[PDB]
């Protein structure tokens, strides 16, 4: 019995309005919104027993729920605040006890968007030296120059995402650790059998989904408006 | 909503000058929130004991109040009851 | 044929404030008292604990302590579910226990009333509404029936614990239940209605009749049984007569305690 | 704070076992549930213990519950690399949708990968579009080796990370170094105690 959340990831500014939404197809009377903050368990914000009803949870302040239909439960932040930064979970259930949890939504609330920047994405090709020594080919992706740290790096081989022989940095590293509001870098690896790299009909792509502004955020600066976008980099197999 | 029945009667046979116990039996009321005073010559009586509330098979509530009293030719004793069912508080007087 | 009754009354004024009080009756004698204010169930009789060990009782009360808290939240969360259909004030009443019979036979009931009308019961292994109940109770019933943990507990409470516990009670409390207490009677009159006052007798069965010598006056009206504080009863019979007929009227009172010495009281 | 977990965090080597505690004061305690949560991911349920004294298992995971002691344990047998995650304890105070869940903060498990055949090397890699900018890759070292962030602030070194070629059953450690601006691969990791037999080719 599946449950979805949208957006999965959001960057927002203090004062702004944010809406988190939960679609649930299992015909469940009951729905719930939680927030997870490191060092605490999940905490209940609002819940609902059926279309039209919403209910205060344990930590309701700053939040307003909306249950228009049996399928949808929305959490509305009428005035976003740095402190509303969190991972947000949604769940549903029937009259039994089990709750079925959504995949979660990372919200970041910044005081100011002046620093948002999409990354540069370079792909680095396997070493001839490596290939001959290990019989394996390591590709390296490098996403740099971005802010904030809300990026999802993913690896694609012939239009399909691959997870095997992949590893991404768990934490983005700061480019100027001293200075504040510093931009970040991130690297990732894809190891393949050398014969797989040496295959010209194999298309390799590293893709970073960067989370930035919405086409509705006011932008005063001269540079291009750092919108939520996909920046990627690409190379074919070669013998 | 249901309106309460008040019944005032004494434990032992009424006899002037002789200490006795006066009972007030309030019954057949809903909701269970209720205010009961026993009254000598119009005035409230201090040490007035109450049984725990309970209800009959028919689901309606009842409670029993009682107090020491010495009946005289002169004094009048009464039970006044306030309940949401009633606009004005109901006073039933004692009669030997 | 004794009936053991755990009567619970709960009031919910608004979303926040609520209270729950309980009494326990064996036949017509109170055995327990549980005020909202108290954290523990009170014995109102030296033999209230029946024949359970200290450890069995403490475990039993701990189950109740938990129930009482849980019952409160659960109702409040049912109002939330049912709204705006239903709203405070809300008055719930429970009536639970068993009736004991010849041999080792019994029957257990658990009846729930809402706003003063009997609507729900435990029967067999599940909650069910009774005839007359509003259809909306079907959701609360469904939610309550989802909780297998409570079901099996309640089944154990009604099937085994009640009959067992009460049996223990009737042993330990034989001298009180079998108490004989003599009545006392006095005559009086009102504008003409004559009144035979019978007071202080136990147990409840009693015979009161106005009589001209031997002829039992067919016009005698018995009143209701009214309780005294000290766990004895009070009853009166009224005879309507025309003034000047009061001569040679008597009141005859029969009660087990008197041992065939009928109380005779002449006008 | 009615659900407490122990330890706060633990590091174990691949293949070893480990035990996680959960102690609570929730009342009543209808059921207890163990969640597994990968970094970034959400909550995967592992088991749900319901009885007064209950025991469960699910693959290499097993679990006990003692309701009297208000205590539960999650046993992982022969830890794998994929076990690296946070383990969340959850107590449910009702057997119906009328209940509330009470989440513990979690226990962080990290599992150290078992590299059988180390082969430490540092290769150079070319940008696909601009063959004049590049990166340096320190690979195939074992987990006894640790990587150290750069001397120069204008040079960057990522922390080590393990990858799994599942179809080959092959795990390898790797870290990446680079700089935008006279910086070379054999000089990239002076800052770390790297194996003395590391392969520097070309
Ligand atoms: C029945 C009397 C016979 C016993 C004789 C002893 C007499 C002792 C004198 C003291 C009596 C004074 C008290 C009078 C009260 C009236 C007695 C009737 C209550 C009987 C029902 C007890 C229920 C026990 C189970 C329980 O605690 N459940 C709660 C707690 O539930 C949790 O904990 C439970 C308790 O955990 C246990 O371990 N239980 C247990 C304990 C001991 C044993 Cl041996 C086995 C299990 C279970 O885990 C459950 O699965 C879990 O969900 C849960 O929240 C329930 O939902 C509570 C509501 C039940 C009543 C529903 C009435 C329906 C009303 C209609 C609604 C109208 C809608 C309006 C909008
Ligand atoms: C407990 O007894 C019930 C039936 O007993 C009646 O219901 C009780 C709650 C109480 O009111 C008693 O005085 C009554 O005598 C058993 O329920 C039966 O269960 C079977 C399947 O198990 C079902 O098919 C029957 O229809 C049920 N009977 C009725 C009348 O509904 C129940 O199994 C007993 N449970 C335990 C734990 O002892
Ligand atoms: C609820 O009702 C009680 C008594 O009727 C009252 O004193 C109290 O103020 C009320 N509380 C709320 C939150 O409405
Ligand atoms: C009854 O007791 C409960 C539990 O201790 C308490 O929270 C509640 O306020 C009490 N109600 C009243 C009216 O005293």
mmCIF file of N, CA and C and ligand atoms in Angstrom, chain C residues 4 6-8 22-24 32 34 41 57 59-60 63-64 66-67 70-71 74-75 78-79 82 86 90 92 94 96-97 110 112 114 120 127 136-137 140-141 144 147-150 153-154 156-158 161-162 165, chain D residues 28-30 52 67 93-96 98, ligand 1:
data_model
loop_
_atom_site.group_PDB
_atom_site.id
_atom_site.type_symbol
_atom_site.label_atom_id
_atom_site.label_comp_id
_atom_site.label_asym_id
_atom_site.label_seq_id
_atom_site.Cartn_x
_atom_site.Cartn_y
_atom_site.Cartn_z
ATOM 1 N N UNK C 4 -23.502 -8.930 40.238
ATOM 2 C CA UNK C 4 -22.341 -8.110 40.470
ATOM 3 C C UNK C 4 -22.284 -7.080 39.340
ATOM 4 N N UNK C 6 -20.247 -3.515 37.951
ATOM 5 C CA UNK C 6 -19.253 -2.447 37.946
ATOM 6 C C UNK C 6 -19.813 -1.317 37.107
ATOM 7 N N UNK C 7 -20.305 -0.283 37.772
ATOM 8 C CA UNK C 7 -20.887 0.848 37.085
ATOM 9 C C UNK C 7 -19.876 1.972 36.892
ATOM 10 N N UNK C 8 -19.664 2.361 35.640
ATOM 11 C CA UNK C 8 -18.747 3.445 35.315
ATOM 12 C C UNK C 8 -19.491 4.620 34.687
ATOM 13 N N UNK C 22 -16.409 5.521 39.342
ATOM 14 C CA UNK C 22 -17.031 4.184 39.344
ATOM 15 C C UNK C 22 -17.467 3.652 40.708
ATOM 16 N N UNK C 23 -18.528 2.863 40.705
ATOM 17 C CA UNK C 23 -18.930 2.133 41.898
ATOM 18 C C UNK C 23 -19.112 0.663 41.562
ATOM 19 N N UNK C 24 -19.149 -0.179 42.585
ATOM 20 C CA UNK C 24 -19.271 -1.603 42.359
ATOM 21 C C UNK C 24 -20.298 -2.152 43.336
ATOM 22 N N UNK C 32 -17.077 -1.430 46.206
ATOM 23 C CA UNK C 32 -15.932 -0.598 45.785
ATOM 24 C C UNK C 32 -16.356 0.793 45.428
ATOM 25 N N UNK C 34 -14.404 4.134 43.152
ATOM 26 C CA UNK C 34 -13.236 4.648 42.433
ATOM 27 C C UNK C 34 -13.439 6.035 41.896
ATOM 28 N N UNK C 41 -8.298 1.877 43.419
ATOM 29 C CA UNK C 41 -9.664 1.475 43.728
ATOM 30 C C UNK C 41 -9.847 1.252 45.230
ATOM 31 N N UNK C 57 -4.713 -9.101 43.018
ATOM 32 C CA UNK C 57 -5.433 -7.835 43.098
ATOM 33 C C UNK C 57 -4.648 -6.681 42.507
ATOM 34 N N UNK C 59 -2.290 -6.670 40.357
ATOM 35 C CA UNK C 59 -2.198 -6.858 38.924
ATOM 36 C C UNK C 59 -3.525 -6.474 38.265
ATOM 37 N N UNK C 60 -4.625 -6.821 38.929
ATOM 38 C CA UNK C 60 -5.948 -6.511 38.423
ATOM 39 C C UNK C 60 -6.174 -5.001 38.369
ATOM 40 N N UNK C 63 -4.202 -3.184 35.579
ATOM 41 C CA UNK C 63 -4.942 -3.269 34.333
ATOM 42 C C UNK C 63 -6.041 -2.204 34.234
ATOM 43 N N UNK C 64 -6.675 -1.903 35.360
ATOM 44 C CA UNK C 64 -7.761 -0.948 35.358
ATOM 45 C C UNK C 64 -7.220 0.456 35.266
ATOM 46 N N UNK C 66 -4.555 1.544 33.886
ATOM 47 C CA UNK C 66 -4.210 1.729 32.486
ATOM 48 C C UNK C 66 -5.457 1.941 31.621
ATOM 49 N N UNK C 67 -6.460 1.072 31.786
ATOM 50 C CA UNK C 67 -7.717 1.185 31.037
ATOM 51 C C UNK C 67 -8.342 2.586 31.142
ATOM 52 N N UNK C 70 -6.578 5.103 29.138
ATOM 53 C CA UNK C 70 -6.742 4.759 27.741
ATOM 54 C C UNK C 70 -8.151 5.045 27.243
ATOM 55 N N UNK C 71 -9.154 4.679 28.048
ATOM 56 C CA UNK C 71 -10.564 4.968 27.739
ATOM 57 C C UNK C 71 -10.786 6.450 27.500
ATOM 58 N N UNK C 74 -9.167 7.570 24.167
ATOM 59 C CA UNK C 74 -9.788 6.874 23.047
ATOM 60 C C UNK C 74 -11.122 7.517 22.648
ATOM 61 N N UNK C 75 -11.933 7.872 23.645
ATOM 62 C CA UNK C 75 -13.185 8.588 23.406
ATOM 63 C C UNK C 75 -12.898 9.927 22.725
ATOM 64 N N UNK C 78 -12.203 9.471 19.367
ATOM 65 C CA UNK C 78 -13.349 9.054 18.569
ATOM 66 C C UNK C 78 -14.216 10.261 18.209
ATOM 67 N N UNK C 79 -14.303 11.231 19.117
ATOM 68 C CA UNK C 79 -15.013 12.460 18.828
ATOM 69 C C UNK C 79 -14.350 13.114 17.627
ATOM 70 N N UNK C 82 -15.385 11.242 14.475
ATOM 71 C CA UNK C 82 -16.786 11.338 14.101
ATOM 72 C C UNK C 82 -17.229 12.735 13.742
ATOM 73 N N UNK C 86 -20.705 14.459 15.977
ATOM 74 C CA UNK C 86 -20.931 14.426 17.426
ATOM 75 C C UNK C 86 -20.059 15.423 18.168
ATOM 76 N N UNK C 90 -20.370 15.097 26.364
ATOM 77 C CA UNK C 90 -20.650 13.706 26.071
ATOM 78 C C UNK C 90 -20.643 12.973 27.395
ATOM 79 N N UNK C 92 -20.731 9.124 28.801
ATOM 80 C CA UNK C 92 -20.702 7.681 28.605
ATOM 81 C C UNK C 92 -20.900 6.947 29.924
ATOM 82 N N UNK C 94 -20.790 2.820 31.473
ATOM 83 C CA UNK C 94 -20.572 1.396 31.311
ATOM 84 C C UNK C 94 -21.261 0.633 32.417
ATOM 85 N N UNK C 96 -20.945 -3.311 33.678
ATOM 86 C CA UNK C 96 -20.276 -4.583 33.453
ATOM 87 C C UNK C 96 -20.249 -5.438 34.705
ATOM 88 N N UNK C 97 -20.294 -6.750 34.491
ATOM 89 C CA UNK C 97 -20.261 -7.714 35.577
ATOM 90 C C UNK C 97 -20.964 -8.983 35.171
ATOM 91 N N UNK C 110 -21.534 -6.645 29.323
ATOM 92 C CA UNK C 110 -20.778 -5.401 29.296
ATOM 93 C C UNK C 110 -21.526 -4.466 28.356
ATOM 94 N N UNK C 112 -22.778 -0.601 27.124
ATOM 95 C CA UNK C 112 -22.384 0.800 27.050
ATOM 96 C C UNK C 112 -23.551 1.698 26.659
ATOM 97 N N UNK C 114 -24.606 5.824 25.689
ATOM 98 C CA UNK C 114 -24.106 7.096 25.174
ATOM 99 C C UNK C 114 -25.247 8.124 25.216
ATOM 100 N N UNK C 120 -24.246 0.063 22.776
ATOM 101 C CA UNK C 120 -23.171 -0.882 22.457
ATOM 102 C C UNK C 120 -23.051 -1.962 23.524
ATOM 103 N N UNK C 127 -17.223 -6.166 19.864
ATOM 104 C CA UNK C 127 -18.168 -5.109 20.119
ATOM 105 C C UNK C 127 -19.201 -5.126 19.033
ATOM 106 N N UNK C 136 -23.972 5.587 12.838
ATOM 107 C CA UNK C 136 -22.640 6.177 12.784
ATOM 108 C C UNK C 136 -21.723 5.507 13.750
ATOM 109 N N UNK C 137 -22.294 4.920 14.798
ATOM 110 C CA UNK C 137 -21.532 4.120 15.749
ATOM 111 C C UNK C 137 -20.772 2.990 15.075
ATOM 112 N N UNK C 140 -16.826 3.783 15.003
ATOM 113 C CA UNK C 140 -16.217 3.488 16.295
ATOM 114 C C UNK C 140 -16.182 1.985 16.607
ATOM 115 N N UNK C 141 -17.299 1.288 16.409
ATOM 116 C CA UNK C 141 -17.330 -0.166 16.546
ATOM 117 C C UNK C 141 -16.249 -0.848 15.695
ATOM 118 N N UNK C 144 -12.823 -0.184 17.244
ATOM 119 C CA UNK C 144 -12.671 -0.932 18.489
ATOM 120 C C UNK C 144 -12.454 -2.414 18.236
ATOM 121 N N UNK C 147 -8.756 -3.829 17.407
ATOM 122 C CA UNK C 147 -7.802 -3.971 18.497
ATOM 123 C C UNK C 147 -7.962 -5.337 19.160
ATOM 124 N N UNK C 148 -7.296 -6.335 18.598
ATOM 125 C CA UNK C 148 -7.402 -7.711 19.091
ATOM 126 C C UNK C 148 -6.954 -7.833 20.534
ATOM 127 N N UNK C 149 -5.962 -7.029 20.924
ATOM 128 C CA UNK C 149 -5.425 -7.025 22.287
ATOM 129 C C UNK C 149 -6.467 -6.721 23.350
ATOM 130 N N UNK C 150 -7.336 -5.746 23.081
ATOM 131 C CA UNK C 150 -8.407 -5.425 24.015
ATOM 132 C C UNK C 150 -9.487 -6.511 23.985
ATOM 133 N N UNK C 153 -8.573 -9.570 26.073
ATOM 134 C CA UNK C 153 -8.546 -9.160 27.477
ATOM 135 C C UNK C 153 -9.961 -9.168 28.025
ATOM 136 N N UNK C 154 -10.823 -8.394 27.379
ATOM 137 C CA UNK C 154 -12.216 -8.267 27.764
ATOM 138 C C UNK C 154 -12.924 -9.626 27.808
ATOM 139 N N UNK C 156 -11.511 -12.465 28.493
ATOM 140 C CA UNK C 156 -10.984 -13.070 29.708
ATOM 141 C C UNK C 156 -11.645 -12.463 30.933
ATOM 142 N N UNK C 157 -11.841 -11.146 30.926
ATOM 143 C CA UNK C 157 -12.506 -10.461 32.042
ATOM 144 C C UNK C 157 -13.926 -10.958 32.300
ATOM 145 N N UNK C 158 -14.697 -11.107 31.228
ATOM 146 C CA UNK C 158 -16.096 -11.484 31.328
ATOM 147 C C UNK C 158 -16.276 -12.991 31.461
ATOM 148 N N UNK C 161 -12.655 -14.100 34.745
ATOM 149 C CA UNK C 161 -12.368 -13.318 35.943
ATOM 150 C C UNK C 161 -13.607 -12.921 36.766
ATOM 151 N N UNK C 162 -14.667 -12.444 36.110
ATOM 152 C CA UNK C 162 -15.869 -12.016 36.833
ATOM 153 C C UNK C 162 -16.422 -13.185 37.624
ATOM 154 N N UNK C 165 -13.903 -14.218 40.413
ATOM 155 C CA UNK C 165 -13.750 -13.197 41.448
ATOM 156 C C UNK C 165 -14.986 -13.123 42.326
ATOM 157 N N UNK D 28 -0.145 2.029 27.423
ATOM 158 C CA UNK D 28 0.320 0.648 27.366
ATOM 159 C C UNK D 28 1.224 0.425 26.165
ATOM 160 N N UNK D 29 1.767 -0.784 26.061
ATOM 161 C CA UNK D 29 2.707 -1.144 25.005
ATOM 162 C C UNK D 29 2.164 -2.276 24.140
ATOM 163 N N UNK D 30 1.268 -1.928 23.218
ATOM 164 C CA UNK D 30 0.691 -2.907 22.297
ATOM 165 C C UNK D 30 1.730 -3.619 21.434
ATOM 166 N N UNK D 52 3.640 -10.489 24.907
ATOM 167 C CA UNK D 52 4.253 -10.145 26.190
ATOM 168 C C UNK D 52 5.738 -10.520 26.205
ATOM 169 N N UNK D 67 7.928 -7.424 27.400
ATOM 170 C CA UNK D 67 7.034 -6.346 27.790
ATOM 171 C C UNK D 67 7.104 -6.051 29.280
ATOM 172 N N UNK D 93 1.142 2.409 21.253
ATOM 173 C CA UNK D 93 0.377 2.251 22.501
ATOM 174 C C UNK D 93 -1.044 1.705 22.351
ATOM 175 N N UNK D 94 -1.483 1.477 21.113
ATOM 176 C CA UNK D 94 -2.758 0.813 20.851
ATOM 177 C C UNK D 94 -2.663 -0.242 19.747
ATOM 178 N N UNK D 95 -3.591 -1.200 19.773
ATOM 179 C CA UNK D 95 -3.746 -2.143 18.661
ATOM 180 C C UNK D 95 -4.709 -1.704 17.558
ATOM 181 N N UNK D 96 -4.892 -0.389 17.403
ATOM 182 C CA UNK D 96 -5.795 0.182 16.402
ATOM 183 C C UNK D 96 -5.340 1.589 16.009
ATOM 184 N N UNK D 98 -6.327 4.219 16.718
ATOM 185 C CA UNK D 98 -6.525 5.164 17.807
ATOM 186 C C UNK D 98 -5.228 5.466 18.551
HETATM 187 C C1 LIG E 1 -15.598 -6.394 33.876
HETATM 188 C C2 LIG E 1 -15.627 -6.491 35.405
HETATM 189 C C3 LIG E 1 -15.272 -7.912 35.871
HETATM 190 C C4 LIG E 1 -13.967 -7.865 36.671
HETATM 191 C C5 LIG E 1 -14.265 -7.929 38.174
HETATM 192 C C6 LIG E 1 -13.198 -7.142 38.949
HETATM 193 C C7 LIG E 1 -13.847 -5.958 39.671
HETATM 194 C C8 LIG E 1 -12.764 -5.046 40.243
HETATM 195 C C9 LIG E 1 -13.415 -3.786 40.811
HETATM 196 C C10 LIG E 1 -12.925 -2.552 40.034
HETATM 197 C C11 LIG E 1 -13.904 -2.177 38.912
HETATM 198 C C12 LIG E 1 -13.990 -0.653 38.784
HETATM 199 C C13 LIG E 1 -13.842 -0.237 37.317
HETATM 200 C C14 LIG E 1 -15.211 -0.206 36.632
HETATM 201 C C15 LIG E 1 -15.020 0.081 35.134
HETATM 202 C C16 LIG E 1 -16.041 -0.709 34.298
HETATM 203 C C17 LIG E 1 -15.382 -2.006 33.819
HETATM 204 C C18 LIG E 1 -15.586 -2.205 32.313
HETATM 205 C C19 LIG E 1 -14.257 -2.004 31.573
HETATM 206 C C20 LIG E 1 -13.848 -3.320 30.914
HETATM 207 C C21 LIG E 1 -12.983 -3.031 29.686
HETATM 208 C C22 LIG E 1 -11.502 -3.142 30.074
HETATM 209 C C23 LIG E 1 -10.612 -3.021 28.835
HETATM 210 C C24 LIG E 1 -9.238 -3.620 29.136
HETATM 211 C C25 LIG E 1 -8.353 -3.494 27.889
HETATM 212 C C26 LIG E 1 -7.741 -2.089 27.788
HETATM 213 O O1 LIG E 1 -7.185 -1.584 28.767
HETATM 214 N N1 LIG E 1 -7.845 -1.503 26.573
HETATM 215 C C27 LIG E 1 -7.348 -0.144 26.310
HETATM 216 C C28 LIG E 1 -5.827 -0.164 26.085
HETATM 217 O O2 LIG E 1 -5.525 -0.787 24.817
HETATM 218 C C29 LIG E 1 -4.131 -1.106 24.624
HETATM 219 O O3 LIG E 1 -3.522 -1.776 25.763
HETATM 220 C C30 LIG E 1 -4.131 -3.037 26.047
HETATM 221 C C31 LIG E 1 -3.717 -3.553 27.436
HETATM 222 O O4 LIG E 1 -2.537 -4.361 27.381
HETATM 223 C C32 LIG E 1 -2.619 -5.467 28.184
HETATM 224 O O5 LIG E 1 -1.583 -6.054 28.493
HETATM 225 N N2 LIG E 1 -3.817 -5.920 28.629
HETATM 226 C C33 LIG E 1 -3.864 -7.023 29.398
HETATM 227 C C34 LIG E 1 -3.833 -6.931 30.798
HETATM 228 C C35 LIG E 1 -3.889 -8.089 31.581
HETATM 229 C C36 LIG E 1 -3.983 -9.340 30.958
HETATM 230 CL CL1 LIG E 1 -4.054 -10.790 31.903
HETATM 231 C C37 LIG E 1 -4.021 -9.438 29.564
HETATM 232 C C38 LIG E 1 -3.963 -8.281 28.788
HETATM 233 C C39 LIG E 1 -3.817 -4.000 24.904
HETATM 234 O O6 LIG E 1 -2.391 -4.122 24.706
HETATM 235 C C40 LIG E 1 -4.469 -3.422 23.647
HETATM 236 O O7 LIG E 1 -4.161 -4.242 22.514
HETATM 237 C C41 LIG E 1 -3.996 -1.982 23.373
HETATM 238 O O8 LIG E 1 -4.781 -1.432 22.299
HETATM 239 C C42 LIG E 1 -7.992 0.465 25.053
HETATM 240 O O9 LIG E 1 -7.678 1.852 25.001
HETATM 241 C C43 LIG E 1 -9.510 0.329 24.922
HETATM 242 O O10 LIG E 1 -9.847 0.879 23.648
HETATM 243 C C44 LIG E 1 -10.280 1.079 26.030
HETATM 244 C C45 LIG E 1 -11.768 1.235 25.652
HETATM 245 C C46 LIG E 1 -12.564 -0.042 25.966
HETATM 246 C C47 LIG E 1 -14.027 0.311 26.279
HETATM 247 C C48 LIG E 1 -14.809 0.548 24.971
HETATM 248 C C49 LIG E 1 -16.270 0.943 25.252
HETATM 249 C C50 LIG E 1 -16.966 1.303 23.932
HETATM 250 C C51 LIG E 1 -17.601 2.686 24.040
HETATM 251 C C52 LIG E 1 -18.304 3.070 22.724
HETATM 252 C C53 LIG E 1 -17.592 4.284 22.091
HETATM 253 C C54 LIG E 1 -18.568 5.426 21.778
HETATM 254 C C55 LIG E 1 -17.922 6.371 20.744
HETATM 255 C C56 LIG E 1 -18.222 7.842 21.092
HETATM 256 C C57 LIG E 1 -17.843 8.778 19.932
#
